[PDB]
Amino acid sequence: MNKNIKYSQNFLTSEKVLNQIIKQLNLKETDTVYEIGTGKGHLTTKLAKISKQVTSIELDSHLFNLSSEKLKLNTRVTLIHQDILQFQFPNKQRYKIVGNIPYHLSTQIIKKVVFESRASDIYLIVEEGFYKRTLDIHRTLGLLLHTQVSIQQLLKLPAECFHPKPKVNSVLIKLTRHTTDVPDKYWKLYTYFVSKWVNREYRQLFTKNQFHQAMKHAKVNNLSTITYEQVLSIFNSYLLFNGRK
Structure with missing residues (x-):
């Protein structure tokens, strides 16, 4: 009233x-x-x-x-x-x-x-x-303090x-x-991995859509909302195929 x-x-x-x-x-x-x-x-x-x-x-x-x-x-x-x-x-x-x-x-x-x-x-x-x-590892800032x-x-x-x-x-x-979810050693190697996996270098980190299939398998269609757990596994695979793990 x-x-x-x-x-x-x-x-x-x-x-x-x-x-x-x-x-x-x-x-x-x-x-x-x-x-x-x-x-x-x-x-x-x-x-x-x-x-x-x-x-x-x-x-x-x-x-x-x-x-x-x-x-x-x-x-x-x-x-x-x-x-x-x-x-x-x-x-x-x-x-x-x-x-x-x-x-x-x-x-x-x-x-x-x-x-x-x-x-x-x-x-x-x-x-x-x-x-x-933080939940956004697409800036490398929340990812650096997320691992x-x-x-x-x-x-x-x-x-x-x-x-x-x-x-x-x-x-x-x-x-x-x-x-720490990422070995301080491969930690600096992790951030960079995010950098390219952030902007849009998906076809650059993938040798032939191989990892792409690993994404769909992890129900990780859009990583925009991804918190960092996915980038932890997905990247972990790149670490087991290259030689930094």
Whole structure:
């Protein structure tokens, strides 16, 4: 009726939606709980309640804010200041790096941590096209960071709590930083393989439609949606016929 929403106000009011996916992560305990990105003001200290290793990478509202670590405050609680990446990303054991993306820079941190860290459970919360830049190995960027992490879109928010009229959709990508699907040696050989297999060098990588038949066999008609799993096998075959495997 008369209602009253004809002004110019906008709020995220999504403390339940985003706080939901982070509260549903449900970790084990041997997986640290890192939260990279920016500093909203409602998380991190709580994300620690899950595991026994918490540490803030941005803003100084963590550590001294954690309401007395119920863990006897004698585990991994540390506050970083300025440059980080090689300052926090540790090694050995398991971790849960759940951080969003500033939307202006991040692939760099996800690059070193995914290049030598053992996150195992990395959750990147982004809103725009970062999740698509990964599943899309047709850019060599998501593929380079895909062979080291098995991602699986799980949560998807169209920004309903983003009043009045949202614009972007923030989703949670369940990345799984594992060992490596491609031998670091044939890894550089893998990216290139993608390059030509991206633009349209299918008749160039195939000696005579032989691999083409391997594509139809893998129900991989259109690889445009392909995530990277196919390029992993398809290429693996080229690696067994040439001599780089």
